Symmetry: D4
Subunit: 121 residues, 8 copies
């Protein structure tokens, strides 16, 4: 089906399992794929017929910059469940949350993270 895409959202947060990460913070990367039929809106050109990717972006921002949690799993789940709950027309959502800079990892990487898929339950 059709989908709204929010790619490479960069936000500063305070999530982490190491106590120090929760008071120092770091950058996070977020990809969000929201499944929704966009044909009605594509034929009417009326924003009310779709869901604004700005409201989905805003929701993601509030969560990532929110209260510090220990795991990316928790934050991604929050983003996913929050998105489905706030926007009833969304059928499913895929959230990829990552840390491009992992503390104590000495060598070079792109990022380490989680990748979850959630359908309307």
């Amino acid at each position: 089906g059709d989908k709204l895409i929010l790619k490479g959202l960069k936000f500063y947060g305070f999530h982490g399992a190491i106590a120090e990460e929760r008071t120092l913070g770091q950058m996070f990367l977020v990809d969000i794929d929201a499944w929704v039929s966009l044909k009605k809106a594509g034929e009417s050109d009326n924003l009310e017929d779709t869901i604004s990717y700005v409201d989905i972006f805003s929701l993601a921002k509030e969560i990532v910059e929110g209260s510090p949690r220990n795991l990316l799993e928790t934050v991604a789940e929050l983003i996913a469940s929050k998105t489905l709950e706030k926007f009833h027309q969304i059928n499913a959502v895929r959230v990829k949350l990552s840390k491009p800079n992992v503390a104590l990892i000495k060598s070079t990487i792109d990022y380490l993270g989680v990748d979850i898929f959630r359908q309307r339950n």
Copy 2:
């Protein structure tokens, strides 16, 4: 099956919900996947046995740079419908229309956009 790929097409355009957006304009990124059996052409080396990506390119350009619409959905929808309409050989099209620079977003992102798939009817 097989597919013609048009990746990272950048076009300046005036689409947007905000009034000033339709005035100033901005850059839009387009990804197009045209589903069509390419075996015939690959075994004949005759351009007439396939769809020229140049023609798909120009059709997409004309749209994106055209009369301003409010939503990316409407623009991607036109590209899909018009592509299927003009090239009967194509069986289905996937269109990804995104804005690398979303007005008012103060944080870094790659892009925000829509992603639709349309089979021939």
Copy 3:
């Protein structure tokens, strides 16, 4: 299941529908996913149990740099058929052939190309 991956191969060739493209040539981008079981080789660690990706690399290179063809479809199709023919161990080949610099396109793009999948 398993596969050998050749990503981002760059070769200068002379393919194209416009006559001048064929005499001037240009750069082409090649991606190849060769479907072949790799567990055997993964456990013996001997070369006889797999195919050299360097052999797959050379075959594509020779084709892309070979005789000029009008379409990318023809080149990709050649790579696919040639690969399956050259290595019986291969079960399927996915070939992506693109042009990062398309003549007469006056605006920025990643590339325009083809993407075929051919099973034995």
Copy 4:
């Protein structure tokens, strides 16, 4: 299913069939996708309800930087096996191992490598 992602891990190693490769060594790139349910940890926010991607990273680092083998196939296989062996919770694992720099090739490429998918079979 949910999965843990380790993308673009860069490690120096000495694998290869050519003796000069085992002497000189080179950089290897690896992507790992660990299939594992993250719902429980997503609800508890307790690191114990999941598998630390740091642990997977360090197991992978140890393998690639370890005893030199002839083929990528073999190293990718060790990574998959040891991962499954060390982390019961993980249902499957996809490992992509590649060489950005293939010796003797005069032209530019991104990388040549392997892509395997493994689960605990009989």
Copy 5:
């Protein structure tokens, strides 16, 4: 002489002549070079003997994201003058302020910007 470096600072502001630019806003790219002797701080390992690049960062962030101006020149001028006014130890400052996304330009570019060098004249 020595210098603190602030490279590729990205900020969202509303500078510009065009009316639509003032309301919509856009991203701005900023490089800052601050000429200042670092030998002392490099020997005492004391943050107070040098100028914290965070303070220089904050000053610039406040300018660029602050009150709207028609020209990058004006903004660049303000950053330079304010930096020199705030930290008497800096002897000179070079500011490079650019717009990576210039409205109404149909083709691609890296950016269009200004590059000024200002030395303490007071």
Copy 6:
């Protein structure tokens, strides 16, 4: 002293020595450094006391996408002369014109081009 910077300008043109290049064309990359005092404008905030970078952009754009020339030297010369001729306050101009995709070159490169400095 101060200068207006136009970095990484991409324009499609038909310059070149090879007859095929003239027919097909290709992308060209342009960097322009214009030395001119920005203090006055920096204090007045009036676009009138400076040079619009869009004016420089347009001049170079009309040149590169224009009539085909043989050399990058010629095109770059046109840009520099035209810029100085149009804005006397410009003390000097530096023009970097390059070709990222050079015909017949098989290996990878960033680009080949010219880099001139012109004053009055």
Copy 7:
């Protein structure tokens, strides 16, 4: 001016004033330019007529990954004085030490750092 060039050296270390930085560590970027006449070596092809850039790299690596300091100024100063002290043929050194990931900065940057130049004596 003839010189040896070490560009973009990435090393993990623990420098910084914040306690969390000292604990967690982070990536550091170093560029080193070593001015020395290379004409003799360029004509003799004798390593002895030049300075091995591997020894200068190795020296820098030990410093950045070594004993933690509060300031980048200090680390850079150490690399400079040590390089000049150990390799007498070096006429002057330029050290650019930077932090690509500055803690508690919510916006994007390339990096913040120091750039120092030190001549023999």
Copy 8:
């Protein structure tokens, strides 16, 4: 003043002190800035009034892929020395020769190399 620029040239060569480096080889990155007045050619649009950067590219390629040298300094010295000797119009040459992949270094860098300037 003016100069011809050859940026980011990637050539495969076999230079190095370690024996294995000479048998295996590696990629080398070369930047070349050749100083030469381009004013005449810029006004005449005649290739003969300038030096073709394709020839400069060719020379450099020949040297980097030729007989192995122990040091980068030696290769860059030849590149400069040979360019000045083959093209009398060049007044000076700056050669940057680097190794993006240094054997046994496992920390990630951009490159290690040399940077020399040779005047007529």
